[PDB]
Amino acid sequence: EVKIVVDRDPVKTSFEEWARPGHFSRTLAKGPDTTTWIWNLHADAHDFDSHTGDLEEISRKVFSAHFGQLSIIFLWLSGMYFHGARFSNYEAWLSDPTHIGPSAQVVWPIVGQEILNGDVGGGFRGIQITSGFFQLWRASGITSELQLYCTAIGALVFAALMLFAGWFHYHKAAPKLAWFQDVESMLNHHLAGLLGLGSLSWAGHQIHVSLPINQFLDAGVDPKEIPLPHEFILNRDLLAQLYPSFAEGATPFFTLNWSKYAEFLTFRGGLDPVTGGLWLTDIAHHHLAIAILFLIAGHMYRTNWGIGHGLKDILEAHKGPFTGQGHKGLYEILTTSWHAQLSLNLAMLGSTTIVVAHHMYSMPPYPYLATDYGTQLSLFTHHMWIGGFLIVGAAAHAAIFMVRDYDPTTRYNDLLDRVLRHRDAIISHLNWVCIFLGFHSFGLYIHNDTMSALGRPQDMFSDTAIQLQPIFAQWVQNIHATAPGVTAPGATTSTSLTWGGGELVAVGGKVALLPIPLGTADFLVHHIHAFTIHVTVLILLKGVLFARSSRLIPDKANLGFRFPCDGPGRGGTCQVSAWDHVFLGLFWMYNAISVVIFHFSWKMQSDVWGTISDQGVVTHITGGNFAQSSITINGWLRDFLWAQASQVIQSYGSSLSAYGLFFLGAHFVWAFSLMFLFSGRGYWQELIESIVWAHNKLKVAPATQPRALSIIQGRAVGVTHYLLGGIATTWAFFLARIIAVG
Amino acid sequence: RQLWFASKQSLTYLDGTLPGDFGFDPLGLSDPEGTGGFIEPRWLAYGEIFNGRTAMMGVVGMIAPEALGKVGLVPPETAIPWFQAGAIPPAGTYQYWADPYTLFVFEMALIGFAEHRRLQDWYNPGSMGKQYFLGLEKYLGGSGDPAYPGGPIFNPLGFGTKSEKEMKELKLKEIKNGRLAMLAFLGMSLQAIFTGVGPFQNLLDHLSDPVNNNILTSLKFH
Amino acid sequence: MRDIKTYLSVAPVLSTLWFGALAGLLIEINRLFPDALSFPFF
Amino acid sequence: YIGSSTNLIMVTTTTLMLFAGRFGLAPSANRKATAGLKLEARESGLQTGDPAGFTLADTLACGAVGHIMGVGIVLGLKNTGVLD
Ligand SMILES: CC1=C(/C=C/C(C)=C/C=C/C(C)=C/C=C/C=C(C)/C=C/C=C(C)/C=C/C2=C(C)CCCC2(C)C)C(C)(C)CCC1
Numbered sequence A: 001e002v003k004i005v006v007d008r009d010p011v012k013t014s015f016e017e018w019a020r021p022g023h024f025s026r027t028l029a030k031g032p033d034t035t036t037w038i039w040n041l042h043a044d045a046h047d048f049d050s051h052t053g054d055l056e057e058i059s060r061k062v063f064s065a066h067f068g069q070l071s072i073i074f075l076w077l078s079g080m081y082f083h084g085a086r087f088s089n090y091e092a093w094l095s096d097p098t099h100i101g102p103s104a105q106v107v108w109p110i111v112g113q114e115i116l117n118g119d120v121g122g123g124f125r126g127i128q129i130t131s132g133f134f135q136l137w138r139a140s141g142i143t144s145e146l147q148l149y150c151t152a153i154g155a156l157v158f159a160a161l162m163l164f165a166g167w168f169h170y171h172k173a174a175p176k177l178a179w180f181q182d183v184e185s186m187l188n189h190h191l192a193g194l195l196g197l198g199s200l201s202w203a204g205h206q207i208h209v210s211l212p213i214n215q216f217l218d219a220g221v222d223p224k225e226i227p228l229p230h231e232f233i234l235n236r237d238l239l240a241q242l243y244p245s246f247a248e249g250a251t252p253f254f255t256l257n258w259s260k261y262a263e264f265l266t267f268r269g270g271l272d273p274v275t276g277g278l279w280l281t282d283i284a285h286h287h288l289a290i291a292i293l294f295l296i297a298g299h300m301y302r303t304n305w306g307i308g309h310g311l312k313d314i315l316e317a318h319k320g321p322f323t324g325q326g327h328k329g330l331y332e333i334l335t336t337s338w339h340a341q342l343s344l345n346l347a348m349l350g351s352t353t354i355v356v357a358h359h360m361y362s363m364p365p366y367p368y369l370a371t372d373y374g375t376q377l378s379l380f381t382h383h384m385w386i387g388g389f390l391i392v393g394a395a396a397h398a399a400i401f402m403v404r405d406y407d408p409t410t411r412y413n414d415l416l417d418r419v420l421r422h423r424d425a426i427i428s429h430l431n432w433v434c435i436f437l438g439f440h441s442f443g444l445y446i447h448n449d450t451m452s453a454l455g456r457p458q459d460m461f462s463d464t465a466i467q468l469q470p471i472f473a474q475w476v477q478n479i480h481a482t483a484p485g486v487t488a489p490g491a492t493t494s495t496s497l498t499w500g501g502g503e504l505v506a507v508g509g510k511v512a513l514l515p516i517p518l519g520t521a522d523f524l525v526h527h528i529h530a531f532t533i534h535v536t537v538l539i540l541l542k543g544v545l546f547a548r549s550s551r552l553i554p555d556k557a558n559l560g561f562r563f564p565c566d567g568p569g570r571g572g573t574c575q576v577s578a579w580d581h582v583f584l585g586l587f588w589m590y591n592a593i594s595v596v597i598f599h600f601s602w603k604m605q606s607d608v609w610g611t612i613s614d615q616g617v618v619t620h621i622t623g624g625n626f627a628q629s630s631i632t633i634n635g636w637l638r639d640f641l642w643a644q645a646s647q648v649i650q651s652y653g654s655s656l657s658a659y660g661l662f663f664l665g666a667h668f669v670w671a672f673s674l675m676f677l678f679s680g681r682g683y684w685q686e687l688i689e690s691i692v693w694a695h696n697k698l699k700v701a702p703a704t705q706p707r708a709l710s711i712i713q714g715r716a717v718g719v720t721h722y723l724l725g726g727i728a729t730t731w732a733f734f735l736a737r738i739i740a741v742g
Numbered sequence B: 001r002q003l004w005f006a007s008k009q010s011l012t013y014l015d016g017t018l019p020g021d022f023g024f025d026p027l028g029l030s031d032p033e034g035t036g037g038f039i040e041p042r043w044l045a046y047g048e049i050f051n052g053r054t055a056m057m058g059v060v061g062m063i064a065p066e067a068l069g070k071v072g073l074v075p076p077e078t079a080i081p082w083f084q085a086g087a088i089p090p091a092g093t094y095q096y097w098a099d100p101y102t103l104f105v106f107e108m109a110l111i112g113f114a115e116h117r118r119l120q121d122w123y124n125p126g127s128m129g130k131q132y133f134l135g136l137e138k139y140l141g142g143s144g145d146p147a148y149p150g151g152p153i154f155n156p157l158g159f160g161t162k163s164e165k166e167m168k169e170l171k172l173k174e175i176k177n178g179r180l181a182m183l184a185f186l187g188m189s190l191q192a193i194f195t196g197v198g199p200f201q202n203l204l205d206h207l208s209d210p211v212n213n214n215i216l217t218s219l220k221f222h
Numbered sequence C: 001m002r003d004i005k006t007y008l009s010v011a012p013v014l015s016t017l018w019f020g021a022l023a024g025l026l027i028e029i030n031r032l033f034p035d036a037l038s039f040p041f042f
Numbered sequence D: 001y002i003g004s005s006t007n008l009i010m011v012t013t014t015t016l017m018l019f020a021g022r023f024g025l026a027p028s029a030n031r032k033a034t035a036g037l038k039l040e041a042r043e044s045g046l047q048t049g050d051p052a053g054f055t056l057a058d059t060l061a062c063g064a065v066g067h068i069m070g071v072g073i074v075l076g077l078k079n080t081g082v083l084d
Helices: A036-043 A055-087 A090-095 A133-139 A145-171 A184-219 A237-242 A258-263 A280-297 A311-315 A338-362 A373-403 A415-421 A423-453 A471-486 A520-545 A578-607 A633-649 A657-678 A682-696 A711-741 B008-013 B041-069 B100-123 B165-194 B199-206 C002-008 C011-032 D005-023 D058-074
Strands: A006-008 A173-175 A505-507 A510-513 A610-612 A618-620
Touching (some): A055 A133, A055 A145, A090 A133, A133 A184, A145 A173, A184 A280, A373 A520, A373 A578, A520 A578, A633 A711, A657 A711, B041 B199, C002 C011, D005 D058
Antiparallel strands (some): A006 A173, A510 A610, A610 A618
16 A cells, blocks of 8 residues: 655765756766856756656655745744844834834945934834734734744744755655655645644634734733733633633533534624724634634545545546546646646646735735735735736646656547647637737727817716626625625625625724725726736647647657747747747736736725725725726826826935835836847847957957857846836835825 | 454554564554654564653652652652642642752753663664773673663563563563553543542542543533 | 865855955945045045 | 433434444445445455454544534524524
8 A cells, every 4th residue: 555665865965066066967067168058057957857757856856845945935934023023113013003104124324224214103213014914913912022033933943944854855765756656645634634734723823812812902901911822821710701601611512502602703704893804703713614624625535544535536437428538547647747736736826826815905804904005005916926927837837748748658638639639729719809808908998098089078988978887796796795684694794895885994094995886997997807818828828739739830849848949941930939938928917917906006096095084084095086087098197107106206315215216227127128138149149259359369268158148048038127127116116105105 | 463453554564573462553654665764663662662661650650749648658748749740830839959940951961861872772782882981881781682671780680580481471561561551641641631630639539429420521621 | 075165166155255245345444434425535 | 411412413323324334334444335326345454353344444434424414413403492
């Protein structure tokens, strides 16, 4: 069956190699005859599958690499907790979080950057932050710098431990194949073990530490004399004072009359007006139910005993009439090629990151989070960016799998075979859908702008003119606002407040959430999003499906994954490798994310965020001009892009001045990218040649023969600089604007 | 081999090498396809021996003081449950002939000396009887197997007279008493975590009143 | 040992330490001569 | 509080689950059910004292499932008092 088989001490911890670069690649280890060697060295370091031919060694290598990654993550967490401990105003922030700006970074007074340590309130000076740690540290009842300090220490310990574990598992006790390739027990554990018990232990930490101290702070007390956590579990009488049921030990649970615990485990829903956040009772019930669900899920597959399924015994049964034999053998494909798994997991992880970004703003989990505007905004846009990048990586590695490790002779399948057998139909129909959406979602904006600039407003696309109504969205919102009436009696309000029914939650003269109406502008922006997503999918899916062989080049696969072209023959064959398909799709994903985040910023600052008067009149941060100025590109310039770019541009000579400076460098690089994206190579090669002559004239010609970057590396550096410029520009814009006005 | 809840991965390596193999291992840990460091069957027998011995000593000692206090002449100055002796600060403490912490690190250093030397012997058997040790050198060679050291330092009276059968009896006795002491220790500690009054007083209770049956209450308290 | 010496003589780490030392020198000069615009020695 | 709703429900569910196992009415350790029928018993190699080959896994899995089905059929207690 399945056992603990491993091997002993393959590679010794000897520095013999560190002084010899490129030991892994036979060609690289010979020596740098030119300068392209030092590019090619970094370029293929992590390329494990091109260093061997057996999956055992590359599996060991990736097992060690995961430990390296985890060590870096732990070190980052430790740095964060430290800087919170020794360099923040966290205690003053806890004193009253309504109007005290979270700052967690000071700068040394050397070169005039003292102005960076701007006024943040609470007798502190420091660069304001928007990471949003403080809402978490108030949720977990840290409420003391000693806790941050010791947590940073423990994080450092875990980091060193993981680094050790890595070194040991690669060098000394290397796992074997029948361990890795055994996915049944891995699924079994990770379902039951990691996620379930994780959520369970967190529910523990919440019901036994957070809930009481948070309730006390909501009652209003200086956290100095707030009783320490362990003094809430050792002596029961405190929790007894809080929750009568909680003073009944464990009888009401075991004896199946769970309703007694109804006080601290409940299903209220909505938000908590004391902090706008979620009712921690609800989130505790959530984490606990999720723990139980993962535990009961974990027991699916047979591992050693006689019960349970087998991932081979599940696929082959499914075989429909149209497709034929079904998923037979697919189990072998997804167990014999790492790149396949990397692609699948990257896709699912990007999608989950996006849905996390979405669910965050509309249901603020933490307390006093939906009122620190910049934090909410920055979190949402960061998660969106991460999701986009993960998705593109998924597509790229899927293409790499399609090229290298796919083969019908032994890694056969009858499903993917059919899929590839009609690729042309797929790409054609997706292309036509892309054209259709492009037309009927952007030409609408063009028509609206034109009919505006021609003095014919009553022929526009808006509520006051020829009208388009997003009826399905309002239908769903009505349903979600009337569902807690009959369908979900156990709830108290709608699942969130953004559903089109209820009241508004406002703390400290500022609003946090309220109903959200949808106008024709929302219809148009949603169709823009749909179109751009469809085009990115078109690019990447075409790349994957045509990575093997196209009707232009018959044997593309033999030429490898990443090569620049196939010469200028047959009318020119530039950018045919799947690698170049990903190079293209990157820009379109960037554009999709950019327009999405702009739409989000405008919609929030024009319909939700803002301040509330003493009487109750709302005056939003931007005045609520969305439904009347999002329908013209010229509007986007005037109402949003130009106007709300003030705070970044007057930012010189103030605390926010750093956000100003980047706003130029971001643009600059942004420029710079074109120089690599537009030019070619031969020109630069000849220029380098003349420069080498000019040097050689002075007996300075270096033996590391200069060489203009190879084509693929040129495109890579170009796209990297371009993404950097764009993202840094929107980053500076967002931070400066929101943290200045809000 | 009195089979109590065995399996086949047990019998893959539990072929009767440990003194008195009963055949009880559903999981099948030490399967010898790849010998896991510290999962070696030799190491497993070593571990059961060492653990059971420590548990015997602990079950005697933790219970000794208060128990003796009952109708004995060890003063009530130490009439305290083992889990209230001071090892569990949320229970009790005591003023000793030093402070708590330095005492702990000192005893840790001593036990570390002993067990480090024992482990070094484990790796290289007999190899302690070479280096200068201010005497004691001509004793620590052991009886070959680190499992069973022997030696007049650890064989004073003299048993297993001319025999391996007598050693087999004495030794079965060892495994049985180790497992029994393990059970008794674990039970005392669980009562302590759930009852809260102390083992010997629990006997004081369960001598007369049968109705106790505190699994019925399942009351979880400090 | 000599292997780690030849590794340390590889341009990345040497360059990082050299640049760190140079930057430290410059920032220390700036500390000991704030804003240092002209050459007020001759 | 013994013999009441909770007691009787839990005991009857778990005992009927164990009987379905031991008599051939459950797809336990040495029985894997197909799309339809169940009687496809095949061995795992887990010989135990039970005369029908019941290891210390199926006699635990059937118990877990019986307790789950019991808790589920009882905590729909909308007709015997929402509080006991
Ligand atoms: C006749 C006979 C016999 C038998 C007997 C019997 C019938 C017994 C029973 C037994 C049993 C009776 C067992 C049981 C088991 C059970 C279990 C093992 C359970 C578990 C449970 C759990 C674990 C739970 C869980 C949970 C929780 C905790 C919460 C949430 C929900 C749930 C439910 C999931 C013998 C063998 C003696 C011998 C021969 C003759």
